[PDB]
RNA sequence: UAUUGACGACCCCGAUUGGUUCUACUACAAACG
């Protein structure tokens, strides 16, 4: 439990990270708009339990990270008023929700053979992530959810300058987001 | 108006499928009287 909270000590400073880049318009000083927003791990041990070390296993290539895991959870009807409204949605945890429903989406709709090579491709730079997925985003038309360049050609979109992508932060949470309701 | 006057081989592979699906870490030892 011990190294488990540290590691949400760390998680919640990532989700806390709203504070700055959702904030009320016109506001001085630059104070937060109300926005709440989460950030989780599944740490099977593999990952380095350090939050630093974490996400830097995540960021394969100098403008490649393999996350997008502060996840807004307040609805965009809520934030549309807020400076960072594009972002909030870019993070928006319904468009992580979303992909890991294309996932569990049924024989599977996007094969795990499938999923798992374009997984493997996404440690790769860019022009060979998108390679990939070009030799199979019109063998499995689920893809043109899982794309986010606008083109349904790549996995990645740009964000400030980075390739980011949900897609593997999809396959992660694919068996956490159960629910009794 | 319909005549001139006999020679000569060709084809040599063509079309298509070129991966598909599943398993992607599991228990542990550190947590918990």
């Known amino acids: 439990f011990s190294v488990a909270y540290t590691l949400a000590e760390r998680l919640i400073k990532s989700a806390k990270e709203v504070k700055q880049k959702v904030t009320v318009t016109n506001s001085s000083p630059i104070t937060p708009f109300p926005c709440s927003a989460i950030?989780?791990?599944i740490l099977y041990d593999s990952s380095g339990i350090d939050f630093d070390r974490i996400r830097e296993k995540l960021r394969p290539?100098?403008?490649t990270e393999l996350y997008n895991r502060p996840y807004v959870v307040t609805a965009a009807e809520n934030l549309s008023q807020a400076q960072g409204y594009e972002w909030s949605q870019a993070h928006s945890l319904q468009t992580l929700a979303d992909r890991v429903?294309?996932?569990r989406s049924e024989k599977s709709a996007?094969?795990?053979s499938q999923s798992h090579a374009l997984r493997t491709a996404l440690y790769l730079e860019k022009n060979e992530a998108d390679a990939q997925y070009?030799?199979?985003s019109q063998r499995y038309k689920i893809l043109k959810n899982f794309?986010?360049?606008?083109?349904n050609k790549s996995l990645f979109h740009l964000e400030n300058g980075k390739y980011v992508t949900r897609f593997?932060?999809?396959?992660?949470?694919?068996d956490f987001f159960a629910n009794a309701n």
């Open 39 to 41: 950030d989780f791990h």
């Open 61 to 63: 290539e100098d403008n």
């Open 101 to 103: 429903s294309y996932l």
């Open 110 to 112: 996007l094969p795990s």
């Open 134 to 136: 070009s030799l199979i």
């Open 147 to 151: 794309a986010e360049d606008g083109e």
């Open 168 to 174: 593997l932060d999809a396959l992660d949470a694919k």
